[PDB]
């Protein structure tokens, strides 16, 4: 009945959204660390190839390694630019909008949770409207519902309750008086009228919206109304709901091209054609025929297989033990870490300098 | 008097915190972009030095340039590692905790704002308790108070209302009945008792806390109490307030050593001693005497001035016009952008390869 406490069909879907919004910061940390980590992997590969080229100066393989190093360095550069120009704002914005909406929802749910007269009469009722519910563990009436911002550790967030279409559990409610409101539970937050609701000497002067505009509490003796938010459109009195849905839908993750390895032909890999054109052909434009001919000299072919073959050569190359530690691996493929590989490259670039004086 | 609407002395300090929390996501975007941008500046400098060394193979200056390139590459590597391992979590955590607390506060303030009976009687009163206040522009009773998550553009956040000590405006209130509560305004949210408050047929079964535990609304006919939060300690029923204060206090910004240039002597600059030891001395340990002697050969000295001198040499070096565009600058110091400089380095590394075959 109108102006009574809320049975679980009303608040459980809000609990479900609040718990899923709690994971948006986790996914933001996950994506920012993954972007940085993939950039580091691209740079390690560039550094390994660069070291291979510095050691093996002259050979066709060294020139192949120079093309390989350029490719991965560009990938590392472009991923860092994507992190600055796109991912940072995406992930800050999703963290902010989701956490803001979660605070809006949580404050409302926490108010319902506390506003009760007894074990059987209050604003937050169980499924059957027999008893008021209580929060214990991280659950309310059996429903996960911590009403708090849990510790942030990286994790991909679910899209069970907030996804591409909207808030899938926040559908139109055609009979709030029977499905949302109990028959007997007293709850002055269910109405703006003075007899049973928030009004004191008369009704509130207007309807009141709560949970960032999700629920509308009329100042008459009528049941609440809720927004249908399962089929959202870019737009409101419920703007924080739109903002969080839009921010989450916009996320790409650290999975765009800059962070992904290229496995097709060599001439099409990032940086290759340009480097071949200017460094080897001394031309500015080329047809792929001339590029592939040039690649055959250095890769013995032009497909991904010949690329992998050169990468395997790079991975097996040993470096001087004094450059890594008293016993550490010395093959490039067994070394990782940008700064470590950087200092190794510097040693060999210095040796290359010395050989040039002598020669 | 107890159980009356709240005059502005109560809610204005909450408005001030909410407006400042709104800037925490801005500062998170600011710091993440600044970290990436400074890393790019370190890498541009490394690439410029590397190009200088590839072109000028042989000379003492080229060896100085190799040491300079190693230094900036290490700075770029270490800043990216700091962004992955420290800054990402710091800025996600500050964004999440501040935005969550802001939603908790904003939902409560928005509830007070709407819960009124008339222009003179309601939960949110002006300074004198003459009229209820209204939100227009982004202000309530003259106080900036948007009650919304504003668009996120980079900006350093103020620490006026949330700082190292705590929430400086949220001090102990010794006379809430006269300073927070009006004398006449009706407000069922000011009390848990049934005559004038949230209770319907009897009092609420317990005191109720609102705004993430900031205000305590007793189920008796007494004035509210508020947390004193101006002198905070790492710990609560008001945990979201502690979380946001701790997350903001932990921020370092993109200003730690990895993102700052080093201006003292050369032997102490990142990477220098190690590179000199292994590449030039072929020793594992050295006294600074031997290092400085070696630096004199290549920098004509060992202070920051000789370092700047080599950097100026690098900045003036021209590259081939066909590597940058039909008319673009061709001196290294006038070029910027990691990927662009990367492709230039590759061209010259390829030329170095060719010279080694011939030699």
């Amino acid at each position: 009945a109108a102006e009574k406490g809320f049975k679980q069909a009303f608040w459980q879907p809000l609990c479900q959204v609040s718990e899923e919004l709690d994971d948006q910061p986790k996914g933001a940390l996950f994506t920012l660390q993954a972007a940085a980590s993939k950039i580091q992997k691209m740079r390690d590969a560039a550094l390994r190839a660069s070291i291979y080229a510095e050691i093996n100066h002259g050979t066709n393989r060294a020139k192949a390694a120079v093309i390989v190093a350029n490719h991965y360095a560009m990938k590392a550069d472009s991923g860092l630019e994507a992190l600055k120009q796109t991912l940072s704002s995406q992930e800050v914005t999703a963290t902010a909008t989701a956490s803001y909406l979660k605070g809006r929802i949580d404050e409302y749910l926490n108010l319902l949770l506390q506003t009760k007269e007894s074990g059987t009469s209050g604003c937050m009722m169980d499924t059957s409207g027999t008893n008021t519910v209580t929060k214990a563990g991280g659950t309310i009436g059996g429903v996960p519902c911590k009403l708090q911002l849990s510790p942030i550790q990286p994790k991909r967030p679910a899209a069970t309750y907030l996804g591409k279409a909207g808030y899938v559990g926040l559908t139109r409610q055609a009979d709030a008086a029977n499905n949302f409101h109990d028959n007997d539970a007293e709850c002055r937050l269910a109405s703006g009228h003075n007899t049973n609701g928030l009004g004191k000497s008369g009704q509130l002067s207007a309807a009141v919206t709560m949970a960032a505009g999700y629920v509308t509490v009329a100042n008459s003796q009528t049941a609440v109304t809720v927004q249908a938010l399962d089929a959202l459109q870019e737009a409101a009195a419920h703007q924080p709901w739109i903002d969080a849905w839009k921010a989450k839908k916009a996320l790409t993750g650290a999975e765009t091209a800059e962070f992904r390895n290229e496995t097709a032909g060599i001439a099409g890999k990032t940086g290759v054609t340009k480097l071949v054109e200017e460094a080897l052909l001394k031309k500015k434009d080329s047809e792929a025929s001339e590029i592939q001919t040039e690649l055959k000299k250095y890769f013995s072919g032009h497909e991904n297989e010949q690329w992998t073959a050169i990468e395997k050569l790079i991975s097996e190359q040993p470096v001087a033990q004094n450059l890594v530690g008293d016993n550490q691996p010395t093959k490039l493929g067994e070394l990782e870490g940008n700064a470590k590989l950087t200092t190794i490259l510097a040693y060999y670039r210095m040796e290359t300098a010395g050989k040039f004086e002598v020669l | 008097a107890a159980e009356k609407g709240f005059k502005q002395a109560f809610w204005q300090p909450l408005c001030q915190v909410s407006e400042e929390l709104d800037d925490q996501p801005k500062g998170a975007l600011f710091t993440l972009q600044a970290a990436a941008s400074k890393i790019q500046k370190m890498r541009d400098a490394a690439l410029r030095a590397s190009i200088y060394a590839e072109i000028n193979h042989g000379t003492n200056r080229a060896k100085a340039a190799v040491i300079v390139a190693n230094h900036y590459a290490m700075k770029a590597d270490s800043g990216l590692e700091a962004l992955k391992q420290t800054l990402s979590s710091q800025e996600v955590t500050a964004t999440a905790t501040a935005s969550y607390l802001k939603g908790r506060i904003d939902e409560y303030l928005n509830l007070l704002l709407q819960t009124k009976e008339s222009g003179t009687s309601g939960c949110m009163m002006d300074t004198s308790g003459t009229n209820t206040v209204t939100k227009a522009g982004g202000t309530i009773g003259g106080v900036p108070c948007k009650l919304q998550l504003s668009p996120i553009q980079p900006k350093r956040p103020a620490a006026t209302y949330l700082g190292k000590a705590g929430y400086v405006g949220l001090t102990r209130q010794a006379d809430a009945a006269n300073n927070f509560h009006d004398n006449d305004a009706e407000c069922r949210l000011a009390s848990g008792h049934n005559t004038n408050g949230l209770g319907k047929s009897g009092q609420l079964s317990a005191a109720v806390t609102m705004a993430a535990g900031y205000v305590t609304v007793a189920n008796s006919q007494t004035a509210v109490t508020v947390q004193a939060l101006d002198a905070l300690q790492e710990a609560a029923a008001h945990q979201p307030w502690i979380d946001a204060w701790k997350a903001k206090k932990a921020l370092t910004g993109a200003e730690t050593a990895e993102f700052r240039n080093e201006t003292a002597g050369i032997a102490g600059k990142t990477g220098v001693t190690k590179l000199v030891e292994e590449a030039l001395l072929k020793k594992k340990d050295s006294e600074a005497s031997e290092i400085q002697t070696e630096l004199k050969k290549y920098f004509s000295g060992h202070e920051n001035e000789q370092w700047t001198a080599i950097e100026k040499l690098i900045s003036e070096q021209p590259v081939a016009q066909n590597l940058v565009g039909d008319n673009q600058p061709t001196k290294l110091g006038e070029l910027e952008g990691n990927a662009k400089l990367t492709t230039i380095l590759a061209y010259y590394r390829m030329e170095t390869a060719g010279k080694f075959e011939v030699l």
Epitope: I55, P318, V319, A320, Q321, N322, T330, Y348, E351, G354, K355, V358 | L281, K282, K284
Partner: nanobody, 125 residues
């Protein structure tokens, strides 16, 4: 680049042996070459080295005047002539190559990227 030594084995005290180390590629002529020896129970130690250009040679004090290192770029091979052997010369002898052209690299194992598998030399009294 792969190094294979040969010419080890048993020898009586006062006898002589010539160790050979052939590299698998003409790259050899850009490598400084060295010989290191690891006695039973002991740590591995420098014996002899020759600069990439063959212009300079270096010897541990325990083998100076007895051992001679030389190189033949045409055969991609470095040699260690070992005269007047004594039981204390018993060891696994490793050939090694360094990409450095700095002679200071030659005297410490840690500057050599390439290593042979080592050959046993056993001198009985």
């Amino acid at each position: 680049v792969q190094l294979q030594e040969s010419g080890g084995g048993l020898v009586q005290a006062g006898g002589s042996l010539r160790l050979s180390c052939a590299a698998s590629e003409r790259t050899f002529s850009s490598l400084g070459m060295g010989w290191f020896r690891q006695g039973p129970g002991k740590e591995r130690e420098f014996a002899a080295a020759i600069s990439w250009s063959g212009v300079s040679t270096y010897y541990a004090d325990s083998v100076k005047g007895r051992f001679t290192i030389s190189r033949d770029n045409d055969k991609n091979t470095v040699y260690l002539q070992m005269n007047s052997l004594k039981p204390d010369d018993t060891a696994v002898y490793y050939c090694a190559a360094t990409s450095s052209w700095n002679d200071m690299a030659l005297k410490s194992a840690g500057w050599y990227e390439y290593w042979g598998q080592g050959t046993q030399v056993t001198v009985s009294s």
